[PDB]
Amino acid sequence: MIKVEIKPSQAQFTTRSGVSRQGKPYSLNEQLCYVDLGNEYPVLVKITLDEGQPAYAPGLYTVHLSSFKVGQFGSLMIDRLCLVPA
């Protein structure tokens, strides 16, 4: 259904960090990918990995149902995009 691609130039992440409101240090790892939204060319999207998960290797993925949730106004929304091999 949604086609996601990790290019060889995107095979690993960068880390961003800081301090939580209850003074706890956080760290978020982010990776770039291309999602085909049906336009002439795929679009660049940023994804945030969960703790202990490595960057996805190059290749083709699709989106896991766990990426979605019901939001605060009752409509569906993406929480965090989770990729599974195509």
Give the binding site for its own copies (CB under 8 A).
1-2, 35-38, 43-48, 62-63, 65-66, 68-70, 73-78, 81
Least Å from the CB of residue 68 to its own copies:
6
- Continuous segment of H or E residues that includes residue 47: strand 43-48
Question: What is the rounded CA–CA span in Å between residue 63 and residue 68?
Answer: 10
Least Å from the CB of residue 42 to its own copies:
11
Least Å from the CB of residue 20 to its own copies:
19
1 three-class SS: coil
